[PDB]
Design a protein around this nucleic acid. Structure first.
Ligand code: MG
Ligand code: MG
Ligand code: MG
Ligand code: MG
Ligand code: MG
Ligand code: MG
Ligand code: MG
Ligand code: MG
Ligand code: MG
Ligand code: MG
Ligand code: MG
Ligand code: MG
Ligand code: MG
Ligand code: MG
Ligand code: MG
Ligand code: MG
Ligand code: MG
Ligand code: MG
Ligand code: MG
Ligand code: MG
Ligand code: MG
Ligand code: MG
Ligand code: MG
Ligand code: MG
Ligand code: MG
Ligand code: MG
Ligand code: MG
Ligand code: MG
Ligand code: MG
Ligand code: MG
Ligand code: MG
Ligand code: MG
Ligand code: MG
Ligand code: MG
Ligand code: MG
Ligand code: MG
Ligand code: MG
Ligand code: MG
Ligand code: MG
Ligand code: MG
Ligand code: MG
Ligand code: MG
Ligand code: MG
Ligand code: MG
Ligand code: MG
Ligand code: MG
Ligand code: MG
Ligand code: MG
Ligand code: MG
Ligand code: MG
Ligand code: MG
Ligand code: MG
Ligand code: MG
Ligand code: MG
Ligand code: MG
Ligand code: MG
Ligand code: MG
Ligand code: MG
Ligand code: MG
Ligand code: MG
Ligand code: MG
Ligand code: MG
Ligand code: MG
Ligand code: MG
Ligand code: MG
Lengths: 210, 147
RNA sequence: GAUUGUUCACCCACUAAUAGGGAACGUGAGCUGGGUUUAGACCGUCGUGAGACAGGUUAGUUUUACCCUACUGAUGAUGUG
RNA sequence: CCUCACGAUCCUUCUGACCUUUUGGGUUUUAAGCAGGAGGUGUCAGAAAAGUUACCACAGGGAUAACUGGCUUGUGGCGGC
RNA sequence: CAUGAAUGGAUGAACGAGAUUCCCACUGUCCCUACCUACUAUCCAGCGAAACCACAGCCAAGGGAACGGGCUUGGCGGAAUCAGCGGGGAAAGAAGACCCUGUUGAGCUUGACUCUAGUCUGGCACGGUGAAGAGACAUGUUUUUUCACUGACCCGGUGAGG
RNA sequence: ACAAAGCAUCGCGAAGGCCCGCGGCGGGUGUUGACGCGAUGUGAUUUCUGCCCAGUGCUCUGAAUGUCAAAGUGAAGAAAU
RNA sequence: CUGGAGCGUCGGGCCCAUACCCGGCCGUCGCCGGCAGUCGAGAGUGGACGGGAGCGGCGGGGGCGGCGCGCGCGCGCGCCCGCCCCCGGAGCCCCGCGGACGCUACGCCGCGACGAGUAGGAGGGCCGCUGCGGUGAGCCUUGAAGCCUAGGGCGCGGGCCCGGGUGGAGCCGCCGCAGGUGCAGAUCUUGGUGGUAGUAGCAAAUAUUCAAACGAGAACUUUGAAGGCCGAAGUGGAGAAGGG
RNA sequence: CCCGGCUCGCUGGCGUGAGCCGGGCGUGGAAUGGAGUGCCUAGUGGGCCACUUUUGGUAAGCAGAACUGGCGCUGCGGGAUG
RNA sequence: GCGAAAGACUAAUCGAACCAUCUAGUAGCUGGUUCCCUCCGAAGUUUCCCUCAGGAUAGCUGGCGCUCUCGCACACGCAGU
RNA sequence: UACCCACCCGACCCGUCUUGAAACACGGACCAAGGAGUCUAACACGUGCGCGAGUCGGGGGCUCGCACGAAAGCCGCCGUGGCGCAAUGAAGGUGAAGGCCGGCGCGCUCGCCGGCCGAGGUGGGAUCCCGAGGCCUCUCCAGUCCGCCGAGGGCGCACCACCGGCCCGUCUCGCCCGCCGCGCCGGGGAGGUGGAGCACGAGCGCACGUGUUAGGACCCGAAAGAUGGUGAACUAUGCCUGGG
RNA sequence: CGCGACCUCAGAUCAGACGUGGCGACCCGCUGAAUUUAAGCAUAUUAGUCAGCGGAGGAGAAGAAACUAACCAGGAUUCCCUCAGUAACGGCGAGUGAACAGGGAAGAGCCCAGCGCCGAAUCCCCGCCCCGCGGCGGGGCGCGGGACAUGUGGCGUACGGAAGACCCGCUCCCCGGCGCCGCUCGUGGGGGGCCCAAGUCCUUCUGAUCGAGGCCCAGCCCGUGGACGGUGUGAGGCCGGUAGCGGCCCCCGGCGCGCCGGGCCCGGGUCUUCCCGGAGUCGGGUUGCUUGGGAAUGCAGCCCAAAGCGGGUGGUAAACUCCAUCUAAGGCUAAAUACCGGCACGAGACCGAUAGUCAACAAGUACCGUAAGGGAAAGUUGAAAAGAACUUUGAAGAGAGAGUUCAAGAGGGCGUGAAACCGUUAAGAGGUAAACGGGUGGGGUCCGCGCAGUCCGCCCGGAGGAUUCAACCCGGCGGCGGGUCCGGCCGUGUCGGCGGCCCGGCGGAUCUUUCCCGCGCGGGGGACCGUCCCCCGACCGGCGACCGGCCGCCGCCGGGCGCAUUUCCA
């Protein structure tokens, strides 16, 4: 029974919230259950980036979100034959392989290749055995470190480049940026209809001829 | 807390702030937003006008990401960029005009509210207003589009 | 007294008269239960029917007093050494 | 000549604009909008709805009856001028 | 008002703890009552419960929730009790069984609304073989009527015996 | 009151009547066959059983030019159609 | 009750409410309240400081008067000239040099004014119950909680505080926080207890009596004797199911 | 109130009319009392009685309005009681 | 389910058992609703209601407030006049 | 003040529903103990505190065997987002800005170009500022200081009333167009109206009060409905087997 | 009228396996209401929930796209935040009501069938030995069986793979044993056992102390231990314990070297030839349930039923038509993730025995119903039974003495021990039932007193009696206040130093890649502004921020002052 100005309210408690309520007095003991994993996993895999394997730079999808960047799932395949890394080797070398990405542009390809090129260079391949041959990095580059990378390997920060102030040529200063949007949005509006008339008018040039 | 309630002050108080003529019975009206057409009408019609009925057109499955488009007013661009980049210029003598990626500060569209300081600018944005156009032009400086 | 569940009536009879009324329409832990007015039944009518009917008819459990009171009796009581 | 002589939501139809949507683009159907008109709720601010229960039940009710009682006295009875 | 023919009408011998009515005999049914007995009650020894109770409990009238025990004015009142008694405590028993209302039900009914199991019919499916032959359209297709057949399918019998 | 014996209708020749079950090639009548089974009506004996097929039922080798889905076949279309 | 205690019209006099007056006391609201250290009562300024001078003055209305006058300016002293001096002292009703006892600055104080209440609100509760963080060199085997008290008191009162006894182990005060928080009621729940009341009642089958035994104790047990009943379709003698 | 002046796309032979700017001018019957305005919002939404007015009814302690006054809701002196 | 038929009976239960759960079922309807004091303090009135035992909104109430005036010799406003 | 007693006046039994209860309405023998507005979500207003065109809070991370700890601290997290920072339209989308001056286009209350100022005005508006004139001050004058009074004048927040303005929708009307392109392209005006709009901001976070719902929902309080199970030990029938 | 293969199908108490019930919080299939809600009501909702039923495990399901998207794109699952209580559904009403993007926990990927390649390269079960035997396994050897040609092994599986040619570089894993070496985080992995400080010191309370003073620093000791419980009261010290990379002994776990027995010739990169998708499935029509899915989101029955530049999808039917994105019909999987059942623990703003679970105890017990089922009440002596020996009355129950006890007015249903209620003792009352309000009066029990309550406190005057002073200086000590801001130190506002600026940092999308390092970007350095420090100089608030001297005053201590003073007493 409402009385004099409120909202409507469709609170959804007609069902049976009561039985299926989860309270959260786990929350802090869970925090700790978790702690001990983060903790244990690291001490188990001693020299290995604690965070996890290396994971690619990647762009967020839908239109609003565009300008952001992420750790993606894993680096593409096309990406690797280019960096010269075999896909099944990568998986052993702490390089994250999604094999399910349609690579569309050279911009985000080489951007993401440089991460592998970077990785190779600052990676100490700890050799199969102690008395081991090629590709494993030398006993100097080996003593120096026992270093787990705390935090995400080569963390991906959204970084922009400053544009210095300009002069504004009398040409940037003529472009009516509103007008040209309305143009755009009407040519894209009617591109299709306009094309039907060229198709009819091209029909009349043949139909007038016969 | 319990202590600071009226129910404390309503002991020995028989009906309990609730009236002994018509008692506090369970659910006199109905249950919740119930009787909107019938008999609770006078609220709904005088206090929430335009509740009962359809209008408009479905857009069904709908996603906001598709039509994400924040707004900024000219009013405050001379915030977005560190105030020193304005004090630098307004001065400088070359007609520098700093660039303002209304993109980079987080806005898919720029709109013509407020004064703008007499100061040439390059605003790179998405969907400009007209008036935003005119004000920036009429100040000096330009309107660059971004995709 | 005859009839009648009846209040109500009518008649026979006697006498002196066979006046009229009230008391929760006096009076169910006074009775009876004849009539109303449960549940079973029957005919009349109405209803398509379940069923209805101040339309008839027959069968249908009628509690408890010891408690204060009133009353009827019975002991008694303070007073008069 | 004035005062009555008509009606929401949701639903349906007809009309109107070189209208908007029909959605990864485009063209045609089709559908949805938008804005006006009609279908209609006679319980008229708008429920899509027959009975019976003496086989009955529960919440209630002296806000609703059947006795008793009060007032009233039409009628009844009784009595005056 | 308002009977009546298998919603049976009309009769009727026997029978009915079935309903009436009248008569003889009989009878404490009554005039109108009376007495006698047994068990009680009663009194004692022993054992000893309940129902109910706001406080309680003498009345008239006034008023008064329009019939009060209270209160006003009156009437008046001597401790504690026993057998009785049913006038009163609208006594108790038992949130009235009568009646109204509720958007509270149940049981039943049908011409209520909305549906259902079931059954009838049509379609489609397992769902074939052969044979005749006909019409309609067209200048092969479709519709297929009818009659067989037995491999599915169905029913019959036995210890599957010709 | 019911039943009752007696009278009366009615469906049924088993790929059936009536009937059960949730289901099967499920089950009862049925260890049956119309003198039986199932469904009703009235209510011994005697005498009788009047007229009405206008309603609603039931039913009938009955026309079904009344309508009537699905599917089925006809057509336009580019397809939903 | 009767030239009335009747009824008309009228006097005086008196009687009485929570009504009005005055006072007393306890509430609340307001006072642009005062009171966080200051002059001043229809307040109608105060002060430098100069030049000049002095008994001047400000020689204005039966106004009755209000804004100007008769406690002084100047004066007493130092001697016409100086002064007209310092509260760590004027001696103080004004004191501005520093401020209550009073000033928990949500304290206290004066005015006035006002304080019928169901439902409801609101406020106020050193009103009450139980829990925790603080805090009370809290209290306690020299006796806590509860309990009990015709032991002194206090609040308007929720309650609170004090007097004794008994009890035997723990308890409270403030500042906060936290509640399953305060009962007379719901034919409320559970347990207990009255009145009724020493009340109803121990009534179906005709039936007992005597003597002895045993026994603390006998109408009631047992034995004997006597009277009785069931009365073979039994209260007779055996079984089932049940019972165990 | 009273002067001066401007504006207009309305209105008209012109003016009206309306709107503005600028100036000029004070207690405008009695009596009373400080005024204004914004949120939340409970109970309530069966009422009853009196004077007077009044409709049904014959009349009611009957039924229904007006107006006011009560009680509810709130005692007290009186109205013996209420 | 069972009924020689009477709504009979189904283990003190029948107009159709008992047991547990859904289950805090729902209730415009009965009953109750627990410490003090201070202040203000009703309505039974409005329109819509499947509305007449209830709601919806009109009122009236409190609280919370705020804008100001000036009783600080130096007020405008308001009003059951 | 309390116990008993005594007197004089007063005086009906509470609770409740109720126009009206001592009710010849109902609950209520008495006593102990238990006992009914609770929690959560969502709103809303009121208020408290933090920060403020931000502000948060998680959920995550980094820091513990916790004694205290399932605490506290800290994080480009800190904003990936909510809320707010702008609305309006059904939708494509548009989007809060005006004044003035000069110049240029015929100022055609139409178009464009350079400068100046920036949220338009009126009336109320707490009100701050200025203030003519008093009003003293031992004399006549002179005069700086100091307050009180102060007619009159200026800025004027907050708020209220009004008049103006700008965004979007829709209408009407009517002008000129730009021209990556062609206008069934896009674009610009005037007037009116609809908008929960802008017109130099007030939210955010966290408390608590109230309220309103959703929630069992203040407690107690049905006749029913559903889902699953157990029963013929009574009785009803049928059958089987016994007896009279 | 035979014998023999196979195919189908029987029988075996055959040889060897295994399945079945329970538990059931969490987990998965299905099934499935009605109360309830809508002020009715059937639509809707409750709600795919309860019951019913089926099924699993230490977790369950799912999972490597026939996905997402419309970006400049992402990339298995699940989970938390978030979207967001939003897109839509609905007598568009009650309600209902998801998703896409981002952030974060965790994060792992993989396997079949077919096409083909490869003497079935395979697999199963026997017998003899060699090792191994408390999860039955390797090694060998056997014309010892059998499946399998209707098809068993390897590579391979779409992210390409196979096969070829030449381009490059070069060889360690697996498993059965059999040893051994490092006990391998709470801060020596799990478990068990066993073990590790300090007072019963004085005195005094008390029945008993654990209490109160004290005891070489709050006393003595210990204190990586002062949690807790026990212990005839409150105890760090008495005792168990507690703390404490404290000790030691078994066992168990896990990981490191050796030996051995077996297994394995397993790479990388280039050019060509060819080779490819899982049928009564997709899809469609229909109906039925479901959600939110819609002119059909999901699931169903039936009917129809495909293709291979195909198919699905790309969320209002449809044709055409353009674009994107997966690849079904086969399959597995840790991790986060869930847990009212179990075992085992830890805690609390909790309840505290009519509360708290029905259950503190013989509790799912007693008892009830035939049965499904229903289902209670009931804790406490004291510290110790020290629980009344013995005399006596009494048939006996009960008493009186006595005894025990700190206490029996703690006596075996015993702490305390209320009210109703009843028990008797004392006082007073008593014809209008009691009971109540106002006002007094009498009497009692107690309570204050007074064997004068004359209540106190100043000051003063008088008369007695008694100590050292007060007033004064001087020595010392300590305050206070004042200022000269005198001297110094301190900080506010200003100025100067451009002096910290690089020996002062941090912030800024400021600027230079003239710089340096690493790969136009990242890191670093260098320039700039805003900020915050030194030097000194000047002004001013000169501030509770002092500190030094000088002053003025006060107080205390010690000297002086012996008495017309200054105290005490009456
Ligand atoms: Mg991670
Ligand atoms: Mg009240
Ligand atoms: Mg009530
Ligand atoms: Mg007679
Ligand atoms: Mg009578
Ligand atoms: Mg009787
Ligand atoms: Mg009687
Ligand atoms: Mg009778
Ligand atoms: Mg009858
Ligand atoms: Mg007849
Ligand atoms: Mg008939
Ligand atoms: Mg005409
Ligand atoms: Mg589409
Ligand atoms: Mg398309
Ligand atoms: Mg009948
Ligand atoms: Mg009545
Ligand atoms: Mg009444
Ligand atoms: Mg009457
Ligand atoms: Mg009676
Ligand atoms: Mg109604
Ligand atoms: Mg019904
Ligand atoms: Mg019909
Ligand atoms: Mg017949
Ligand atoms: Mg006939
Ligand atoms: Mg016929
Ligand atoms: Mg009051
Ligand atoms: Mg609690
Ligand atoms: Mg209580
Ligand atoms: Mg006999
Ligand atoms: Mg025998
Ligand atoms: Mg009412
Ligand atoms: Mg009436
Ligand atoms: Mg009957
Ligand atoms: Mg009522
Ligand atoms: Mg009465
Ligand atoms: Mg009642
Ligand atoms: Mg939101
Ligand atoms: Mg129902
Ligand atoms: Mg199992
Ligand atoms: Mg209801
Ligand atoms: Mg309903
Ligand atoms: Mg209903
Ligand atoms: Mg439904
Ligand atoms: Mg559902
Ligand atoms: Mg749902
Ligand atoms: Mg279930
Ligand atoms: Mg996903
Ligand atoms: Mg200890
Ligand atoms: Mg201890
Ligand atoms: Mg020890
Ligand atoms: Mg499928
Ligand atoms: Mg559904
Ligand atoms: Mg798959
Ligand atoms: Mg799986
Ligand atoms: Mg699994
Ligand atoms: Mg107990
Ligand atoms: Mg218990
Ligand atoms: Mg006890
Ligand atoms: Mg006890
Ligand atoms: Mg004791
Ligand atoms: Mg004791
Ligand atoms: Mg003890
Ligand atoms: Mg005791
Ligand atoms: Mg006594
Ligand atoms: Mg006595």
């Amino acid at each position: 029974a409402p009385s004099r100005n409120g909202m409507i309210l469709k609170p959804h408690f007609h069902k049976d919230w009561q039985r299926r309520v989860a309270t959260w007095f786990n929350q802090p003991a869970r925090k700790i259950r978790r702690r001990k994993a983060r903790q244990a996993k690291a001490r188990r895999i001693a020299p290995r980036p604690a965070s996890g394997p290396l994971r690619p730079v990647v762009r967020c999808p839908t239109v609003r979100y565009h300008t952001k960047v992420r750790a993606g799932r894993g680096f593409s395949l096309e990406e690797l034959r280019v960096a010269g890394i075999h896909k099944k080797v990568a998986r052993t070398i702490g390089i994250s392989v999604d094999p399910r990405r349609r690579n569309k542009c050279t911009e985000s390809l080489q951007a993401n290749v440089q991460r592998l090129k970077e990785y190779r260079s600052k990676l100490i391949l700890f050799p199969r055995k102690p008395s081991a041959p090629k590709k494993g990095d030398s006993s100097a580059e080996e003593l120096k470190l026992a270093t787990q990378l705390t935090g995400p390997v080569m963390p991906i920060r959204n970084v922009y480049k400053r544009e210095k102030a300009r002069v504004i040529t009398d040409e940037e200063k003529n472009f009516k940026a509103f007008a040209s949007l309305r143009m755009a949005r009407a040519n894209a509006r009617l591109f299709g209809i306009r094309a039907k008339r060229a198709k009819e008018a091209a029909e009349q040039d043949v139909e007038k001829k016969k | 807390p319990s202590r600071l309630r009226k129910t404390r002050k309503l002991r020995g108080h028989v009906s309990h702030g609730h009236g002994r003529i018509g008692k506090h019975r369970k659910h006199p009206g109905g249950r919740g937003n119930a009787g909107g057409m019938h008999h609770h009408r006078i609220n709904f019609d005088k206090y929430h006008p335009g509740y009962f009925g359809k209008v408009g057109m479905r857009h069904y499955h709908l996603k906001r990401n598709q039509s994400f488009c924040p707004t900024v007013n000219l009013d405050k661009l001379w915030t977005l960029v560190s105030e020193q980049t304005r004090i630098n210029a307004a001065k400088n003598k070359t007609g520098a005009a700093p660039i303002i990626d209304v993109v980079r500060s987080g806005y898919y569209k720029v709109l013509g509210k407020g004064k703008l300081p007499k100061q040439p600018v390059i605003v790179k944005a998405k969907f400009f207003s007209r008036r935003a156009e005119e004000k920036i032009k009429g100040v000096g400086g330009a309107c660059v589009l971004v995709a």
